[PDB]
């Protein structure tokens, strides 16, 4: 503790040589490896590697796509890492043309297992999922090892390019007519109740709204139909205890000027999707609501 | 040990061993500096009276 | 520059065999009552909140407010304890019973050791022990949290063999891993005070609302903008079978109620939700990204 010591400006790591260089300068040994500069040393993004079988790589080779775990029963396949697109076949929001279009693309036993494990359970869909973030750097082999962002920006190694979130156009929705300068992206599963099964309808709802109470208040606007159908099923069936009718989870944010249409291009199959461009991921959690 | 007399039991010698132990008790004082104070310490603007 | 920490010291002496037991927990959460800098071991850990009569909900309600903290580095005569920051990944040791897969949303809960002994005892020290909170996946917390509330509602009914058996079924959760039975809150034929107050918080909300909401729903259903409160007036009836050819055509509503007491019943409905709020909404405190082999360490991005 000296007066000068508090007076010193904070010292940024680039000003000091790399710790490996600090050892090699002291001991002077020279390996073949180029430790002169460390890659990935400036990354506020936090990441995790997920092994995903080759039957699920389609439409994920493009960087930027949700990873969602899916717990199913059987102890051998403890989980399975669904894309957002693969979940669209089950959704009721998706166009039948788009659904039959992309359903052909998932003609693999690994993906068809996902439809079977979706049908299998009585308990609601929103329970089985846990969003993991977004694809980047597809390992692209007999079994892709996808790198997935938990927080921060999606971008290339070396920050040479910014990966963009891609959301299939039928799921994308906007409540408001005058977009704000910044707006948050939320993923919204909404059960509409029906006799044989309560079919889910997925959406992704960008909005400048941040407050939870005001957000759910505006949400019950469009979802009054599903909410009233839940109330009607509540009285139609005794000793049936159906729970929440939409579920919202904060998915991240984008600047609302970045939003614009595009298409994914795979197996010569154009797919119209909205494209948040500099989409920083900041995961939230599913919030039950009526 | 004192030496004993006739018909009285004698005294066996007794080595004794013992041990002390140290005890810890640290101290701490906080002192704080406003950022407005630090920013004039290191940054310096247009040098004016 | 040095990482910010919280030094901790042991008033009672430490054995060479004792300090080796801390190197095992060097990467484990250690909850602290209050952010400070120097801390005696007495204020360390959850053991200060042990009680005889007070139960699981006391621990849960005080545990919500304690400052989570990892152990950082044993010094022999000292212990560092880093306070996690939101949005940076910290490794944690797997004190919880259940194995964590990657992507799980963990949360902290009081320890829930059951009767027959397993590995529990580590750091007896001067009639004092370092109890550590369970770290458990979110759904298992949602399930344990209800098992206790139902055994509390059954605490009044242990004469019946059917309840006597159903309690045993709630007692032993069956999870996707080795199973861990849950200790019964009831003891000595009599329920502990915390679960009793929480069950009152639930049953007041279950009963005070039924007699109260009709005076308001009858008036709101007139407007029709929402278009479901008329359907909700039938939902009020709480009938299970289809109505007989008898009394019910409208829900029962309170009569004549004296002008002011209606405010007191209304506000007492809202006072019970506040007692219930500690159990209503569990909150994530970690989100594990990758797990070590043997599911022993995990590296979770901190939340909160």
Coordinates of C-alpha atoms in Angstrom, one line a residue:
Chain A
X1 CA 0.0 0.0 0.0
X2 CA 1.8 3.1 -1.4
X3 CA 0.1 6.3 -2.6
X4 CA 1.5 5.6 -6.1
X5 CA 0.1 2.0 -6.1
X6 CA -3.5 3.2 -5.9
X7 CA -2.7 5.9 -8.4
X8 CA -1.7 3.4 -11.1
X9 CA -4.1 2.9 -14.0
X10 CA -5.6 -0.6 -14.3
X11 CA -3.3 -2.9 -16.4
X12 CA -4.9 -4.7 -19.3
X13 CA -3.7 -8.2 -20.1
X14 CA -2.5 -7.4 -23.6
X15 CA 0.0 -5.0 -22.2
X16 CA 1.6 -7.9 -20.4
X17 CA 3.1 -10.8 -22.4
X18 CA 1.1 -14.0 -22.3
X19 CA 1.6 -16.2 -19.3
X20 CA 3.2 -18.9 -21.5
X21 CA 5.5 -16.2 -22.9
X22 CA 6.3 -15.1 -19.3
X23 CA 7.5 -18.6 -18.6
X24 CA 9.3 -19.1 -21.9
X25 CA 11.1 -15.7 -21.4
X26 CA 12.3 -16.9 -18.0
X27 CA 13.3 -20.4 -19.2
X28 CA 14.1 -19.6 -22.8
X29 CA 12.9 -23.0 -24.2
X30 CA 11.3 -22.7 -27.7
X31 CA 8.6 -25.2 -28.6
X32 CA 7.2 -25.7 -32.1
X33 CA 3.9 -24.2 -30.9
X34 CA 3.3 -20.5 -31.6
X35 CA 2.5 -19.2 -28.1
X36 CA 3.4 -15.7 -29.2
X37 CA -0.3 -14.9 -29.5
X38 CA -3.2 -16.7 -27.9
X39 CA -6.4 -17.1 -29.9
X40 CA -9.9 -16.9 -28.4
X41 CA -8.4 -14.7 -25.7
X42 CA -11.0 -11.9 -26.1
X43 CA -14.3 -13.6 -25.8
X44 CA -17.1 -12.5 -23.5
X45 CA -19.0 -15.3 -25.0
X46 CA -19.3 -18.4 -22.8
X47 CA -19.6 -21.7 -24.7
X48 CA -20.0 -25.4 -24.4
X49 CA -19.4 -28.3 -26.8
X50 CA -22.3 -30.7 -27.4
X51 CA -22.0 -34.0 -29.2
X52 CA -25.0 -34.3 -31.5
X53 CA -25.5 -37.3 -33.7
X54 CA -25.4 -36.9 -37.5
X55 CA -29.2 -37.4 -37.9
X56 CA -29.8 -33.9 -36.4
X57 CA -27.2 -31.8 -38.2
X58 CA -29.5 -30.8 -41.1
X59 CA -30.4 -27.1 -41.1
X60 CA -27.8 -26.6 -38.3
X61 CA -24.8 -26.4 -40.5
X62 CA -25.7 -22.8 -40.8
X63 CA -24.4 -21.1 -37.6
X64 CA -27.1 -19.8 -35.4
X65 CA -29.9 -22.2 -34.3
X66 CA -31.3 -23.0 -30.9
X67 CA -30.1 -26.1 -29.0
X68 CA -32.7 -27.5 -26.7
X69 CA -32.2 -30.6 -24.6
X70 CA -35.1 -33.1 -24.4
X71 CA -35.4 -35.5 -21.5
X72 CA -37.1 -38.8 -22.4
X73 CA -37.6 -41.6 -20.0
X74 CA -35.4 -44.4 -21.3
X75 CA -32.1 -44.4 -19.4
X76 CA -30.0 -45.2 -22.4
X77 CA -30.9 -42.2 -24.5
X78 CA -31.0 -39.9 -21.5
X79 CA -31.5 -36.8 -23.6
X80 CA -31.5 -35.6 -27.2
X81 CA -30.5 -32.2 -28.6
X82 CA -33.3 -30.9 -30.8
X83 CA -33.0 -27.9 -33.0
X84 CA -35.7 -25.3 -33.1
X85 CA -36.5 -26.4 -36.7
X86 CA -36.9 -30.0 -35.8
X87 CA -39.4 -29.0 -33.1
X88 CA -41.4 -27.2 -35.8
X89 CA -43.0 -30.4 -37.2
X90 CA -44.8 -30.9 -33.9
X91 CA -45.9 -27.2 -33.6
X92 CA -49.4 -26.3 -34.8
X93 CA -48.4 -22.8 -35.7
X94 CA -46.2 -23.9 -38.6
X95 CA -47.7 -24.0 -42.2
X96 CA -48.7 -27.4 -43.4
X97 CA -46.6 -26.7 -46.5
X98 CA -43.6 -25.7 -44.5
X99 CA -44.2 -28.6 -42.1
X100 CA -44.4 -31.2 -44.9
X101 CA -41.5 -29.4 -46.5
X102 CA -39.0 -29.7 -43.6
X103 CA -40.4 -33.0 -42.4
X104 CA -38.9 -34.6 -45.4
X105 CA -35.6 -33.1 -44.4
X106 CA -35.6 -35.1 -41.1
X107 CA -35.8 -38.6 -42.6
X108 CA -33.4 -40.2 -40.1
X109 CA -34.0 -42.6 -37.3
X110 CA -32.2 -40.3 -34.9
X111 CA -34.7 -37.5 -35.8
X112 CA -37.7 -39.7 -36.1
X113 CA -36.9 -40.8 -32.6
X114 CA -37.6 -37.2 -31.6
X115 CA -41.2 -37.3 -33.0
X116 CA -41.7 -40.6 -31.2
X117 CA -40.4 -39.3 -27.9
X118 CA -42.6 -36.2 -28.3
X119 CA -45.7 -38.3 -28.8
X120 CA -44.7 -40.7 -26.0
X121 CA -45.4 -38.5 -22.9
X122 CA -48.6 -37.5 -21.2
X123 CA -46.8 -34.6 -19.4
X124 CA -46.6 -31.3 -21.2
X125 CA -44.0 -30.4 -23.7
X126 CA -42.6 -27.3 -22.0
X127 CA -41.4 -29.5 -19.1
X128 CA -39.1 -31.7 -21.2
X129 CA -37.1 -28.9 -22.8
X130 CA -34.1 -26.8 -21.7
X131 CA -32.8 -24.3 -24.2
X132 CA -29.0 -24.4 -24.5
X133 CA -28.2 -21.5 -26.8
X134 CA -27.1 -21.3 -30.4
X135 CA -25.1 -23.2 -32.9
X136 CA -21.7 -22.1 -34.2
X137 CA -18.7 -23.9 -35.7
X138 CA -20.4 -27.2 -36.8
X139 CA -17.8 -29.9 -36.5
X140 CA -19.6 -31.6 -39.4
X141 CA -18.5 -35.2 -39.4
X142 CA -20.0 -38.6 -39.0
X143 CA -21.1 -37.0 -35.7
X144 CA -21.1 -33.2 -35.4
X145 CA -19.7 -31.7 -32.2
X146 CA -21.6 -28.4 -32.1
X147 CA -20.3 -25.5 -30.2
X148 CA -23.1 -23.7 -28.4
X149 CA -23.1 -20.2 -26.9
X150 CA -24.5 -19.9 -23.4
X151 CA -24.1 -16.1 -23.1
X152 CA -22.8 -13.3 -25.2
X153 CA -22.5 -12.6 -28.9
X154 CA -22.4 -15.1 -31.7
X155 CA -19.5 -14.5 -34.0
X156 CA -16.7 -16.2 -35.8
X157 CA -13.4 -17.1 -34.4
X158 CA -11.2 -14.0 -34.9
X159 CA -14.5 -12.1 -34.9
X160 CA -14.3 -12.1 -38.7
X161 CA -18.0 -12.5 -39.0
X162 CA -21.1 -12.2 -36.8
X163 CA -23.4 -15.2 -36.9
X164 CA -27.1 -14.4 -37.0
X165 CA -30.0 -16.0 -35.2
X166 CA -32.3 -17.6 -37.7
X167 CA -35.9 -18.1 -36.7
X168 CA -38.3 -19.9 -39.2
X169 CA -40.7 -17.3 -40.5
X170 CA -43.9 -19.0 -39.3
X171 CA -42.7 -18.9 -35.7
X172 CA -41.7 -15.2 -35.8
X173 CA -44.2 -12.7 -34.5
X174 CA -44.3 -9.1 -33.5
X175 CA -47.0 -7.6 -31.3
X176 CA -46.2 -3.9 -31.9
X177 CA -46.5 -1.5 -34.9
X178 CA -43.6 0.8 -33.8
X179 CA -40.5 -1.1 -33.1
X180 CA -38.2 0.1 -30.3
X181 CA -34.5 0.9 -30.6
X182 CA -33.8 -2.4 -28.8
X183 CA -36.0 -5.4 -28.3
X184 CA -35.8 -8.6 -26.4
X185 CA -36.5 -12.1 -27.9
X186 CA -38.6 -14.5 -25.9
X187 CA -39.5 -18.1 -26.9
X188 CA -43.2 -18.9 -26.3
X189 CA -44.8 -22.3 -26.2
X190 CA -48.6 -22.1 -25.9
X191 CA -50.8 -25.1 -25.4
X192 CA -54.2 -24.9 -27.0
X193 CA -56.3 -27.6 -25.4
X194 CA -58.2 -30.2 -27.4
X195 CA -59.7 -33.6 -26.8
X196 CA -57.3 -36.4 -27.7
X197 CA -54.2 -34.2 -27.0
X198 CA -53.3 -30.6 -26.1
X199 CA -51.4 -29.7 -29.3
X200 CA -48.6 -27.1 -28.8
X201 CA -48.0 -24.0 -30.8
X202 CA -44.5 -22.5 -30.8
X203 CA -43.7 -18.9 -31.3
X204 CA -40.7 -16.5 -30.9
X205 CA -41.9 -13.0 -29.8
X206 CA -39.4 -10.2 -30.2
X207 CA -40.6 -7.1 -28.2
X208 CA -39.1 -4.1 -26.6
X209 CA -41.1 -5.1 -23.5
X210 CA -38.9 -6.2 -20.6
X211 CA -41.1 -6.1 -17.5
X212 CA -42.7 -9.5 -16.9
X213 CA -46.1 -8.3 -15.8
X214 CA -46.6 -6.0 -18.8
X215 CA -45.3 -8.6 -21.1
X216 CA -47.7 -11.3 -20.0
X217 CA -50.5 -8.8 -20.0
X218 CA -50.0 -8.0 -23.7
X219 CA -49.5 -11.8 -24.3
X220 CA -52.9 -12.7 -23.0
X221 CA -54.3 -10.4 -25.7
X222 CA -53.6 -12.7 -28.7
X223 CA -53.7 -15.8 -26.5
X224 CA -57.2 -15.2 -25.1
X225 CA -58.4 -18.0 -27.4
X226 CA -56.0 -20.6 -25.9
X227 CA -56.6 -19.3 -22.4
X228 CA -60.4 -19.5 -22.7
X229 CA -60.0 -23.0 -24.2
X230 CA -57.9 -24.0 -21.2
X231 CA -60.6 -22.6 -18.8
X232 CA -63.2 -24.5 -20.8
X233 CA -61.3 -27.8 -20.6
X234 CA -60.9 -27.1 -16.9
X235 CA -64.6 -27.4 -16.4
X236 CA -65.3 -29.9 -19.2
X237 CA -63.2 -32.5 -17.5
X238 CA -63.3 -33.3 -13.8
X239 CA -60.3 -34.8 -12.0
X240 CA -58.2 -33.4 -14.8
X241 CA -55.5 -31.0 -13.7
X242 CA -54.1 -29.3 -16.8
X243 CA -51.6 -26.6 -16.1
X244 CA -50.2 -23.5 -17.8
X245 CA -51.4 -22.4 -21.2
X246 CA -48.5 -20.5 -22.5
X247 CA -44.9 -20.5 -21.1
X248 CA -42.4 -17.7 -21.8
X249 CA -38.7 -17.7 -21.4
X250 CA -36.3 -14.9 -22.1
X251 CA -34.2 -15.9 -25.0
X252 CA -31.9 -12.9 -25.5
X253 CA -32.0 -9.5 -27.3
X254 CA -31.4 -7.8 -30.6
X255 CA -31.4 -4.2 -31.8
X256 CA -34.6 -4.4 -33.8
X257 CA -33.0 -2.7 -36.7
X258 CA -31.1 -5.9 -37.5
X259 CA -34.4 -7.9 -38.1
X260 CA -35.1 -8.8 -41.7
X261 CA -36.1 -11.8 -43.7
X262 CA -33.9 -14.4 -45.3
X263 CA -33.8 -18.1 -46.2
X264 CA -31.8 -21.1 -45.2
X265 CA -30.5 -23.1 -48.1
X266 CA -30.0 -26.8 -47.6
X267 CA -30.4 -29.8 -49.9
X268 CA -31.5 -27.2 -52.4
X269 CA -34.5 -26.4 -50.2
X270 CA -35.1 -22.7 -49.5
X271 CA -36.7 -22.0 -46.2
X272 CA -37.9 -18.5 -45.3
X273 CA -36.8 -17.4 -41.9
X274 CA -36.5 -14.1 -40.1
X275 CA -32.9 -13.2 -39.3
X276 CA -31.9 -11.4 -36.1
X277 CA -28.3 -10.5 -37.0
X278 CA -26.2 -9.5 -33.9
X279 CA -28.3 -11.6 -31.5
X280 CA -26.6 -11.7 -28.1
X281 CA -27.7 -14.7 -26.1
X282 CA -28.8 -14.2 -22.5
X283 CA -30.8 -17.2 -21.4
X284 CA -33.7 -17.0 -19.0
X285 CA -36.1 -19.7 -17.8
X286 CA -39.6 -21.0 -18.5
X287 CA -42.1 -18.9 -16.6
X288 CA -45.5 -20.6 -16.2
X289 CA -48.5 -18.5 -16.7
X290 CA -52.2 -18.8 -17.4
Chain B
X1 CA 10.9 -36.7 45.8
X2 CA 11.8 -36.9 49.5
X3 CA 13.2 -40.1 51.0
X4 CA 10.9 -42.2 53.2
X5 CA 11.1 -43.8 56.6
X6 CA 10.7 -47.2 58.1
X7 CA 7.4 -49.0 57.4
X8 CA 6.0 -46.2 55.2
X9 CA 5.5 -46.7 51.4
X10 CA 8.2 -45.0 49.3
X11 CA 7.5 -42.5 46.5
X12 CA 7.9 -43.4 42.8
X13 CA 9.4 -40.7 40.7
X14 CA 7.0 -39.1 38.1
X15 CA 8.0 -37.5 34.9
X16 CA 5.4 -35.0 33.7
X17 CA 4.9 -33.8 30.1
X18 CA 2.7 -30.9 28.9
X19 CA 2.1 -28.8 25.8
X20 CA 0.9 -25.3 25.0
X21 CA -0.9 -24.4 21.7
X22 CA -1.0 -21.1 19.8
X23 CA -4.3 -19.3 19.0
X24 CA -5.1 -17.2 15.9
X25 CA -7.0 -13.9 15.8
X26 CA -6.6 -11.7 12.7
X27 CA -7.7 -8.1 12.1
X28 CA -9.0 -6.0 9.2
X29 CA -9.9 -2.4 8.4
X30 CA -11.7 -1.1 5.3
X31 CA -10.8 2.2 3.7
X32 CA -12.6 3.5 0.6
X33 CA -11.9 6.0 -2.2
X34 CA -14.6 7.6 -4.3
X35 CA -14.2 7.1 -8.0
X36 CA -14.4 10.8 -8.5
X37 CA -11.3 11.0 -6.3
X38 CA -9.4 8.3 -8.3
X39 CA -10.3 9.8 -11.7
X40 CA -8.5 13.0 -10.8
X41 CA -5.6 11.0 -9.5
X42 CA -4.7 9.3 -12.8
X43 CA -6.6 11.1 -15.6
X44 CA -5.9 14.8 -16.0
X45 CA -7.8 17.1 -18.3
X46 CA -7.0 20.4 -19.9
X47 CA -4.6 21.8 -17.3
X48 CA -6.4 24.7 -15.7
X49 CA -5.9 26.5 -12.4
Chain C
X1 CA -4.1 -8.2 -9.6
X2 CA -5.5 -10.4 -6.8
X3 CA -9.0 -11.9 -7.1
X4 CA -11.5 -10.6 -4.5
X5 CA -12.2 -13.1 -1.7
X6 CA -13.4 -13.4 1.9
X7 CA -11.0 -14.7 4.5
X8 CA -12.2 -17.2 7.1
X9 CA -10.5 -18.3 10.3
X10 CA -11.0 -21.2 12.7
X11 CA -11.2 -20.2 16.4
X12 CA -10.6 -23.9 17.2
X13 CA -7.3 -25.5 16.2
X14 CA -7.1 -27.6 13.0
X15 CA -5.6 -31.0 12.7
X16 CA -3.3 -32.0 9.9
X17 CA -6.0 -34.7 9.2
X18 CA -8.7 -32.0 9.5
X19 CA -7.2 -29.5 7.0
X20 CA -7.0 -32.4 4.4
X21 CA -10.8 -32.6 4.6
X22 CA -11.1 -28.9 3.5
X23 CA -9.0 -29.6 0.3
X24 CA -11.9 -31.8 -0.7
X25 CA -14.4 -29.0 -0.5
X26 CA -12.0 -26.4 -2.1
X27 CA -14.5 -26.3 -5.0
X28 CA -17.8 -26.4 -3.2
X29 CA -20.5 -23.8 -2.3
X30 CA -20.4 -22.5 1.2
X31 CA -23.3 -20.2 2.1
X32 CA -22.6 -17.2 4.3
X33 CA -25.2 -15.3 6.3
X34 CA -23.8 -11.9 5.3
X35 CA -21.2 -10.5 3.0
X36 CA -18.2 -9.4 5.1
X37 CA -14.5 -9.7 4.8
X38 CA -13.2 -11.6 7.8
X39 CA -15.5 -14.4 9.1
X40 CA -15.1 -16.8 12.0
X41 CA -16.0 -20.4 11.3
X42 CA -19.0 -20.0 13.5
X43 CA -20.8 -17.8 11.0
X44 CA -19.6 -20.1 8.2
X45 CA -21.9 -22.7 6.7
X46 CA -25.5 -23.5 7.4
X47 CA -25.1 -25.1 10.8
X48 CA -25.9 -21.8 12.6
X49 CA -29.5 -22.2 11.3
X50 CA -30.1 -25.7 12.7
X51 CA -33.0 -25.8 15.2
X52 CA -34.8 -28.5 17.0
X53 CA -38.4 -27.4 16.6
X54 CA -38.0 -25.3 13.4
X55 CA -38.0 -27.4 10.2
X56 CA -37.2 -27.4 6.5
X57 CA -39.0 -24.2 5.6
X58 CA -37.0 -22.1 8.1
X59 CA -33.8 -23.3 6.4
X60 CA -35.3 -22.7 3.0
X61 CA -36.5 -19.2 3.8
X62 CA -33.2 -18.1 5.4
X63 CA -31.3 -19.8 2.7
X64 CA -32.9 -17.7 0.1
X65 CA -31.2 -14.6 1.6
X66 CA -27.8 -16.0 2.5
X67 CA -24.9 -15.0 0.3
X68 CA -23.7 -18.0 -1.8
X69 CA -20.0 -18.5 -1.8
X70 CA -17.5 -21.0 -3.1
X71 CA -14.4 -22.1 -1.1
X72 CA -11.4 -21.0 -3.0
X73 CA -8.1 -22.0 -1.4
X74 CA -7.2 -23.5 2.0
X75 CA -4.3 -21.7 3.5
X76 CA -3.7 -23.9 6.6
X77 CA -4.4 -21.1 9.0
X78 CA -6.9 -19.3 6.7
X79 CA -9.6 -20.0 4.1
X80 CA -10.5 -17.9 1.0
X81 CA -14.2 -17.7 -0.1
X82 CA -14.9 -16.1 -3.5
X83 CA -18.4 -14.5 -3.9
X84 CA -19.6 -15.5 -7.4
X85 CA -20.7 -12.8 -9.8
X86 CA -23.7 -13.2 -12.1
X87 CA -22.8 -14.2 -15.6
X88 CA -19.3 -15.8 -15.1
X89 CA -18.8 -19.6 -15.0
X90 CA -17.7 -21.1 -11.7
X91 CA -16.9 -24.8 -11.0
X92 CA -18.8 -26.4 -8.2
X93 CA -18.4 -29.7 -6.4
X94 CA -21.4 -32.1 -6.6
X95 CA -22.7 -32.2 -3.0
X96 CA -26.2 -33.0 -4.3
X97 CA -27.3 -36.6 -4.4
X98 CA -28.3 -36.6 -8.0
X99 CA -26.0 -36.6 -11.0
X100 CA -26.1 -33.5 -13.2
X101 CA -26.3 -33.7 -17.0
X102 CA -25.0 -30.7 -19.1
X103 CA -27.5 -27.9 -19.4
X104 CA -29.3 -28.6 -16.1
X105 CA -30.6 -25.7 -14.1
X106 CA -29.4 -26.2 -10.6
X107 CA -30.7 -24.7 -7.4
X108 CA -29.7 -24.8 -3.7
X109 CA -31.8 -26.5 -1.1
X110 CA -31.4 -27.4 2.6
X111 CA -29.8 -30.7 3.2
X112 CA -32.3 -33.5 3.4
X113 CA -30.4 -36.5 4.8
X114 CA -32.7 -39.4 5.6
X115 CA -32.6 -41.9 8.5
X116 CA -30.2 -44.8 7.7
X117 CA -26.7 -43.5 7.6
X118 CA -24.6 -43.0 4.4
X119 CA -21.6 -40.7 3.8
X120 CA -22.5 -37.6 5.8
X121 CA -19.9 -37.0 8.5
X122 CA -16.8 -35.0 7.6
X123 CA -15.8 -32.0 9.8
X124 CA -16.8 -32.4 13.4
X125 CA -15.0 -29.5 15.1
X126 CA -15.6 -28.4 18.7
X127 CA -19.2 -29.5 18.8
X128 CA -19.7 -28.0 15.4
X129 CA -20.0 -29.3 11.9
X130 CA -20.0 -27.8 8.4
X131 CA -23.3 -28.7 6.9
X132 CA -23.6 -27.9 3.3
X133 CA -26.7 -27.2 1.2
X134 CA -27.8 -29.7 -1.5
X135 CA -27.3 -28.6 -5.1
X136 CA -30.0 -30.2 -7.1
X137 CA -31.6 -30.0 -10.6
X138 CA -34.6 -27.7 -10.8
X139 CA -37.3 -30.3 -11.4
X140 CA -36.2 -32.4 -8.4
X141 CA -36.5 -29.3 -6.3
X142 CA -39.9 -28.7 -7.7
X143 CA -40.9 -32.3 -6.7
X144 CA -39.3 -32.4 -3.3
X145 CA -40.9 -29.0 -2.5
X146 CA -44.3 -30.6 -3.0
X147 CA -43.7 -33.9 -1.4
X148 CA -43.1 -32.1 1.9
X149 CA -46.2 -29.9 1.5
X150 CA -48.4 -33.0 1.0
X151 CA -46.9 -34.9 3.9
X152 CA -47.7 -31.7 5.9
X153 CA -51.4 -31.8 4.8
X154 CA -51.4 -35.5 5.9
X155 CA -49.7 -34.7 9.2
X156 CA -53.1 -34.4 10.7
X157 CA -54.2 -37.9 9.4
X158 CA -51.9 -40.7 10.6
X159 CA -54.8 -42.8 12.0
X160 CA -55.7 -44.0 8.5
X161 CA -53.9 -46.9 6.9
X162 CA -54.5 -45.4 3.4
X163 CA -52.8 -42.2 4.3
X164 CA -50.3 -44.2 6.3
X165 CA -49.3 -45.9 3.0
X166 CA -49.5 -42.9 0.7
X167 CA -47.1 -41.0 3.0
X168 CA -44.7 -43.8 2.5
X169 CA -45.0 -43.5 -1.3
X170 CA -44.4 -39.8 -1.2
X171 CA -41.5 -40.5 1.1
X172 CA -39.3 -42.3 -1.5
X173 CA -38.8 -40.3 -4.6
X174 CA -37.9 -42.3 -7.7
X175 CA -35.6 -40.2 -9.9
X176 CA -33.6 -40.8 -12.9
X177 CA -30.7 -41.9 -10.7
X178 CA -30.1 -43.8 -7.5
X179 CA -33.1 -43.1 -5.3
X180 CA -33.2 -41.0 -2.1
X181 CA -36.0 -41.2 0.3
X182 CA -37.2 -37.9 1.8
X183 CA -37.4 -37.5 5.7
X184 CA -40.9 -37.3 7.1
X185 CA -41.6 -33.8 8.5
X186 CA -44.1 -35.3 11.0
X187 CA -42.5 -36.4 14.2
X188 CA -43.7 -37.2 17.8
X189 CA -47.3 -37.4 16.4
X190 CA -47.1 -33.6 15.9
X191 CA -46.2 -31.4 13.0
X192 CA -43.4 -28.8 13.2
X193 CA -44.3 -25.1 13.3
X194 CA -42.9 -24.1 9.9
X195 CA -44.8 -26.7 7.9
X196 CA -47.9 -25.9 9.9
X197 CA -47.7 -22.2 9.1
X198 CA -47.1 -23.0 5.5
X199 CA -50.0 -25.4 5.3
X200 CA -52.1 -22.7 6.8
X201 CA -50.8 -20.3 4.2
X202 CA -52.0 -22.8 1.6
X203 CA -55.4 -23.7 3.1
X204 CA -56.3 -20.1 3.8
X205 CA -55.7 -19.3 0.2
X206 CA -57.7 -22.4 -0.7
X207 CA -60.7 -21.5 1.5
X208 CA -60.8 -17.7 1.9
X209 CA -60.8 -17.3 -1.9
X210 CA -63.8 -19.6 -2.4
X211 CA -66.2 -17.6 -0.3
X212 CA -64.8 -14.3 -1.4
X213 CA -64.4 -14.4 -5.2
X214 CA -68.1 -14.7 -6.0
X215 CA -68.9 -11.2 -4.8
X216 CA -66.5 -9.9 -7.4
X217 CA -67.0 -12.4 -10.3
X218 CA -70.7 -11.8 -10.3
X219 CA -70.1 -8.2 -11.0
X220 CA -67.2 -8.6 -13.5
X221 CA -69.1 -11.2 -15.6
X222 CA -71.6 -8.5 -16.6
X223 CA -69.1 -6.6 -18.8
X224 CA -68.1 -9.5 -21.1
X225 CA -65.0 -8.0 -22.7
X226 CA -62.9 -11.0 -21.6
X227 CA -65.7 -13.5 -22.3
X228 CA -64.6 -16.2 -19.9
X229 CA -65.8 -15.0 -16.5
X230 CA -69.3 -16.4 -17.2
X231 CA -67.6 -19.7 -17.8
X232 CA -65.6 -19.1 -14.6
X233 CA -68.8 -18.6 -12.5
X234 CA -69.5 -22.3 -13.2
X235 CA -65.9 -23.1 -12.4
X236 CA -66.5 -21.6 -8.9
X237 CA -69.0 -24.4 -8.1
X238 CA -66.2 -26.9 -7.4
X239 CA -68.5 -29.7 -8.4
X240 CA -66.9 -32.9 -9.7
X241 CA -69.9 -34.8 -11.0
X242 CA -72.4 -33.2 -13.3
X243 CA -75.0 -31.3 -11.3
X244 CA -77.9 -33.2 -9.8
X245 CA -81.5 -32.2 -10.2
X246 CA -81.2 -30.1 -7.0
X247 CA -79.8 -26.9 -5.7
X248 CA -76.9 -25.7 -7.8
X249 CA -77.5 -23.1 -10.5
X250 CA -75.2 -20.4 -9.2
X251 CA -72.2 -20.5 -6.8
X252 CA -72.7 -19.9 -3.1
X253 CA -71.9 -16.3 -2.1
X254 CA -71.6 -14.6 1.3
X255 CA -74.7 -12.9 2.7
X256 CA -75.1 -9.4 4.0
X257 CA -71.4 -9.3 5.1
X258 CA -70.7 -6.4 7.4
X259 CA -69.3 -3.5 5.4
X260 CA -65.8 -3.4 6.9
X261 CA -64.9 -7.0 7.6
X262 CA -64.9 -7.7 3.9
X263 CA -61.7 -5.6 3.7
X264 CA -60.1 -7.6 6.5
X265 CA -60.9 -10.9 4.9
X266 CA -59.6 -9.5 1.6
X267 CA -56.4 -8.4 3.0
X268 CA -55.9 -11.6 5.0
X269 CA -56.2 -13.5 1.7
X270 CA -53.2 -11.4 0.5
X271 CA -51.3 -11.9 3.8
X272 CA -51.2 -15.6 3.3
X273 CA -49.7 -15.4 -0.2
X274 CA -46.8 -13.6 1.4
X275 CA -46.2 -16.5 3.8
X276 CA -46.4 -18.8 0.8
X277 CA -44.1 -16.8 -1.4
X278 CA -40.9 -18.5 -0.2
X279 CA -42.2 -21.8 -1.5
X280 CA -44.1 -20.6 -4.5
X281 CA -41.2 -19.8 -6.8
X282 CA -37.9 -21.6 -6.6
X283 CA -35.0 -19.8 -8.3
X284 CA -32.1 -21.1 -10.3
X285 CA -28.7 -20.2 -9.0
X286 CA -26.5 -22.1 -11.5
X287 CA -26.7 -23.4 -15.0
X288 CA -24.2 -26.1 -15.6
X289 CA -22.6 -26.1 -19.0
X290 CA -20.2 -29.1 -19.0
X291 CA -19.9 -31.7 -16.3
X292 CA -16.7 -33.5 -15.3
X293 CA -16.5 -37.3 -15.7
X294 CA -17.9 -39.1 -12.7
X295 CA -20.3 -36.2 -12.5
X296 CA -18.3 -34.9 -9.6
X297 CA -17.2 -31.4 -10.7
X298 CA -19.4 -29.2 -12.9
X299 CA -18.8 -25.8 -14.4
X300 CA -22.0 -23.7 -14.1
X301 CA -22.6 -20.2 -15.2
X302 CA -23.9 -18.4 -12.1
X303 CA -27.4 -17.0 -11.9
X304 CA -28.6 -14.6 -9.3

